[PDB]
Symmetry: C3
Subunit: 334 residues, 3 copies
Amino acid sequence: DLKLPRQKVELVAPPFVHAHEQATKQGPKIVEFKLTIEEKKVVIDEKGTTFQAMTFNGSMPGPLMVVHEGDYVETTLVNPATNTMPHNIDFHSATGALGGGALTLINPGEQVVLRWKATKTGVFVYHCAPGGPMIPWHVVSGMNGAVMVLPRDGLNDGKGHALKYDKVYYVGEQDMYVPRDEKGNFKSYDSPGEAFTDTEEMMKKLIPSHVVFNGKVGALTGKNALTANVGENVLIVHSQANRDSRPHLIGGHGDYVWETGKFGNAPEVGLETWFIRGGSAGAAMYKFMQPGIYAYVTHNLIEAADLCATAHFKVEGKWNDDLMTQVKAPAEIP
Amino acid sequence: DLKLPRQKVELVAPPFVHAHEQATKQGPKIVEFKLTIEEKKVVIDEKGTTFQAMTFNGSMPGPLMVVHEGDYVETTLVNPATNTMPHNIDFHSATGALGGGALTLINPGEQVVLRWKATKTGVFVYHCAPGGPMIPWHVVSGMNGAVMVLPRDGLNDGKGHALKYDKVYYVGEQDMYVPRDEKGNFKSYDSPGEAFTDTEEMMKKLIPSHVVFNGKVGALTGKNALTANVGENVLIVHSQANRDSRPHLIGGHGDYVWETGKFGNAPEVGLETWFIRGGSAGAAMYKFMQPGIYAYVTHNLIEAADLCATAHFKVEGKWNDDLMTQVKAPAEIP
Amino acid sequence: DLKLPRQKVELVAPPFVHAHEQATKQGPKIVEFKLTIEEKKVVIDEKGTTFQAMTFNGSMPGPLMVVHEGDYVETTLVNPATNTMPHNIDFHSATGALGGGALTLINPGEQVVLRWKATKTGVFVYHCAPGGPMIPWHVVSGMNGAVMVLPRDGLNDGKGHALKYDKVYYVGEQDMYVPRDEKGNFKSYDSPGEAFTDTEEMMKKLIPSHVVFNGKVGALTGKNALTANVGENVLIVHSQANRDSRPHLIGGHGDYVWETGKFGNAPEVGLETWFIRGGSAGAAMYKFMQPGIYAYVTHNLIEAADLCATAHFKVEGKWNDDLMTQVKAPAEIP
Ligand SMILES: OC[C@H]1O[C@@](CO)(O[C@H]2O[C@H](CO)[C@@H](O)[C@H](O)[C@H]2O)[C@@H](O)[C@@H]1O
Ligand SMILES: OC[C@H]1O[C@@](CO)(O[C@H]2O[C@H](CO)[C@@H](O)[C@H](O)[C@H]2O)[C@@H](O)[C@@H]1O
Ligand SMILES: OC[C@H]1O[C@@](CO)(O[C@H]2O[C@H](CO)[C@@H](O)[C@H](O)[C@H]2O)[C@@H](O)[C@@H]1O
Ligand SMILES: O=N[O-]
Ligand SMILES: O=N[O-]
Ligand SMILES: O=N[O-]
Ligand SMILES: O=N[O-]
Ligand SMILES: O=N[O-]
Ligand SMILES: O=N[O-]
Ligand SMILES: [Cu+2]
Ligand SMILES: [Cu+2]
Ligand SMILES: [Cu+2]
Ligand SMILES: [Cu+2]
Ligand SMILES: [Cu+2]
Ligand SMILES: [Cu+2]
C-alpha cells in the first residue's frame, strides 16, 4: 500500500560510506539495502591472533547505511546456509518490535525483509540480538554497524548556519574477548560454537583483550590511513555497540560534535575529547588546518596504544606557522 | 520557627512512585517522610545466590521521594535495634553537612530528623555514607535511592512547551559484589559483618558479579514487567549511586532526556542510549508508539543479558505498519 | 617575525594556580612558560607504597597554565641529563604536529621551544606522548597536566551574565598501576625502566591499584585541604588524561559546569555529579552556602574511599538553618 519511489543503495565497506546527498530536494522514498551475514575466522592483530567473527556483509563494523528523515528503509537480511547460527537485526533508529529484532530472526538458509520509517535523525547503532546470552555474544563477535538519518536540509550548527562535510568516514570500534590458555597465549577455535563457552566466561569479567577500529589492530593505518587536505571539513561517525569510548583527534579538535549522535540537538563546539556511550553512535566534524599525520584514538591510551584502538589520518597541504611552530629545535641545555 | 503547612507522604516501593502533582498551585510546605533501615539477607538471582543487603525501607533501590522546588523535606530516619551497624543519609539534593550525612549518624536503636530545603530541581541520589571504607560498602550493599524535585510549573522542553508524563517509574540500578569460593561458587554469609572482608577485596577490583534493577535479576519482568499503552508518555527515572550506566529502551527512544538529571537544563531530544554517571540520577521520557514487549537495559549488553540488568515493558495498543512492517516473513533464500 | 609583547609566567604547584586575569583589556601576547621534567620515586599512600613517577615540574599533575584566547603560548621543555628517558609534550589545546608532540621529542640533556596559538577556549589536557606503548606508560606514570584558555571577556553563563570566580583550584586525577608480588604486597622498583614490564602487564588489564588527586592518597586533606568561605565562588578544574572520572562535591553542587571543559559551550546548571572523559579536562564552579567540611570525590565511591580519590574543603562562615537543620538529634526510638 506504500506508493513511494524505490531507490537501491550499493553499500560499501567501512571506513568509506556509500554516496549520498546531504541536503536533498527529494521527498521520501523507500531506500533498499541488502545485508548478508558472514561468520568467519579472521586475524585481528599483527601477531596473528585469530578470532571467530560474525559480521554483516563481511566487515567489522557492518557498513554505514545513509538515508534522510522520513524515508522508509527496506532491508533484506540474508543468512546463508553456510552459517551455523540464527541471526537477526535491531536498528536503534527504528520504532517497534525490539528495533526489528522480533521480526527478523532467520535460520541459516533464510532471508527476511523489514521496513522501518526513519522518524529520528542522527547516527544510530544497528546490531544482531537473537535472544538472551546470545545478544552480547553476537554483538561482541562483530555483528554491529550504524545508520545515519540526515535532516533533508542537511546538518546545521544550531545557530542558523549550515554545516556541510567534504567527506565522511565511519569508524566502528569493537571490544573483543579472546581467551588465553594456561601459558598465556591466545586460543584459537574451529567454530563460533566452540569459542562460546570460554568467550562467555571472559566476557562476564568485562575486560576486553583487544579494542580495534575497523576489525583489526592497525586497520586504519599505512596504505589504509584516513586522508584529508588542509581546508577540508571531515565528518567522523564513531560507533560502539557494547562499551564506552572516548574519541580524540591528536593534533586536532572536534569543531562540531554530537556526542550522543542525534541531530535534533545542536552540536557542541571545540571539543578535545568526546564520549560515545556503549550502545550508540556519535559524530564529530573537523576542518583540518595543518598537514601531517594525526592519530584518531580512544583516549584511554592503554586501549589506544596497547589494545589496538588507533587510526591515522594523513593530511596534505601547507604548514601554518602562526598556529604552531618549533621556535628552537632540540638542543643541549645551556 | 518555620511556619509552613505540613504534608505527610506514604512512600511506595519501587518501581512505583508515590502520588504527586506535576505542576502545582500549592506554595512551599514541609513534606514529611520516614525511612526505616533494614539489613537483610536476600536472593538476587534465579540460581538462588544470596546477598547481605542493607536497605532504606526494605527495598533496593530505596523509594523515590517527590517534592517541588522550595519545599522543605523533613525525613525521620530510623535505625531499629534489630540492625547491627550505624547508618546515616546523604541527599545529593541538599546543601550542607555532607548532604545531611554529618547530621544523621544513628546507631541501632536510634532515630534522627533532618530537614533540608529543596533549592535544586531534578532527580538526585540519596545514599548512606557512614564514613571511610564503610561509605562504598553500605552503598553497594543497597543503601541508595533517589529524590525528584519538580519545578512548580511542572516539566518543560526548554522551548516553551510543557512536558507532562502519564506515569513515572523509578529504576534503581545496583552493582553488587558477591565473592566466589575456590571451586567458583558464590559465597553465602551469616551477617553483613562477616561478608565485609571478602566483599571489600572484591569491590576494590572494580568488577561487579551482578548488575540488577530493583534488587534482583528479573525483578522487572513477567508479572512485574513495567506497563504502558500506545500514546502514553512515560517518565523513567534511573539512578546509579556508584557506577556508570547507559540506559536504552529497545524498540524505543528517549524522546526527552535529562541525562545529568537536572531540570534547570533543557532536555536533549531523540536519543538512542543515554548515560547515567555513577553517583547520579537521570530521567527520560518516551511516548509509546507501538504495542508489544520492549526491553529496558543498560547497553553494556554483557551486563544486561549476563549480569542481570534487563527490565521489560509490556505495551498495549494497535500496531502501526507505517512505522515498521515485516514486508516478507522468513523464507528460504531463492 | 611574530612582533607581540612577551610575558613570563612563574608556574605554581597544584592545586594552586598562577596569578592571572579573568577578563582582560590586554591584547594577544606571547606567554612564556618553562617545564622541567623530573623522573623520581615517590610515596603514593599512607602505607608507604612507592611509585616510579615521571613528572612535569616535579608534581602530579603538572602545573595549570592559564592564558587567553588568541595568546601564543611559548613553552621551553627541558629534559635534564639526570633523567633516563626521552620525553615530549602534546597540548590538546594546540593545532598540528600531534599537539606539539612531533616537534618536542627531547633526549636527556636537551631542551626544545614550542609555540602554539591558543585558538580554542576551555580547559585542556597536556601530556607526554613519546610514541607507541610509551605513550600510556608516560601518562599513567604522572606526565600530564592542564592548560586553561580563557575568553578575553572572562567566563559567562550562556545567557548574557558574567561568571567571575573568587578562586580557582586544579585537581588532577591520576590512575596508577602498581604491581603486586606473589604474597600480595606492592612491588618497589629501582628505576622506571625496571618497573616497565610488570607495570605494562598490569596496565593492559585496565584496573588501577590507586586513583589519587594531586599525586597521593590524602594529598588534598588536613593541612592541605582546599579552603573557601561562605559566599565565595570557587572554580574547580578537574583533569584525567587516561581514564574517566565522575566528580562530585559532597554537600554541594556544580552551580555551573562545563563537563566537556570548553567555554564556547554554555555551562550546565545545578549538577550533582559530572563526568570527565578520559583524555580531557572539565570545570565546575560553586558558590558555597554552608560552612564546614566538604569532600570532593570521584563518585565511584570504591575509588574515592578505598583507592585514594578524595579531597576535602574546609569552609568558614555562618550556618544557614533555612537550607538545612537537624530538627531532632539522634535519640532512642519511641
Ligand atoms: O602436569 C599436570 C598438572 O598440571 C595442571 C596445571 O597445573 O594441569 C595441566 O595438566 C592437566 C593434565 O595434562 C591438563 O588437563 C590441564 O589442562 C593442564 O593445565 C594440574 O591440574 C595437573 O596436576
Ligand atoms: O588439599 C590441600 C591443598 O589445597 C589447597 C588449595 O590448593 O588449600 C585447600 O585446602 C586447605 C586445607 O584444607 C584449605 O584451608 C584451603 O582453604 C583450600 O583451598 C592448598 O593450599 C593445600 O595445600
Ligand atoms: O617453593 C617453590 C615453588 O614456589 C613457586 C610458587 O608457587 O615459585 C616460588 O619459588 C620459586 C623458586 O624460588 C620462585 O622463583 C618463584 O618466583 C616463587 O613464586 C613455584 O613455582 C615453585 O615450585
Ligand atoms: O589450556 N586451556 O585453557
Ligand atoms: O646540539 N646542541 O645544542
Ligand atoms: O573457599 N574460600 O574462599
Ligand atoms: O519457506 N520457504 O520459503
Ligand atoms: O614475586 N614476584 O612477582
Ligand atoms: O537518648 N535517647 O533518647
Ligand atoms: Cu547474529
Ligand atoms: Cu541495542
Ligand atoms: Cu548504612
Ligand atoms: Cu554521594
Ligand atoms: Cu615522558
Ligand atoms: Cu592526548
